[PDB]
Design a protein around this ligand. Structure first.
Ligand SMILES: *SC[C@H](NC(=O)CC[C@H](N)C(=O)O)C(=O)NCC(=O)O
Length: 82
């Protein structure tokens, strides 16, 4: 398992996902693209999407935060933690 999540300090949609991921006790690896544009633009190569947040789990992309919420609550996120 390798949960990654792109975040930005000045981005509340980013921090939204952290209330979820903390509620679910998830072992994410947070990528602040506030003080960074390198790994930011590495994200843009990972998925083609420019915006944050974006979650990746074992190099498979999710989508946005609402996408993750549904992907969690449906049980797509949860069993990949194993
Ligand atoms: S909170 C920072 C910005 N987020 C969004 O705009 C999210 C948009 C959704 N993906 C959508 O539904 O379209 C952000 O990431 N801006 C990037 C930028 O171009 O500055």
């Amino acid at each position: 398992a390798n949960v990654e999540i792109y975040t930005k300090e000045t981005c509340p949609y980013s921090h939204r996902a952290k209330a979820l991921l903390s509620s679910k006790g998830v072992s994410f690896q947070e990528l602040p693209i506030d003080g960074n544009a390198a790994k930011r633009e590495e994200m843009i190569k990972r998925s083609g999407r420019t915006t944050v947040p974006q979650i990746f789990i074992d190099a498979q992309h999710i989508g946005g935060y609402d996408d993750l919420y549904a992907l969690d609550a449906r049980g797509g996120l949860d069993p990949l933690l194993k």
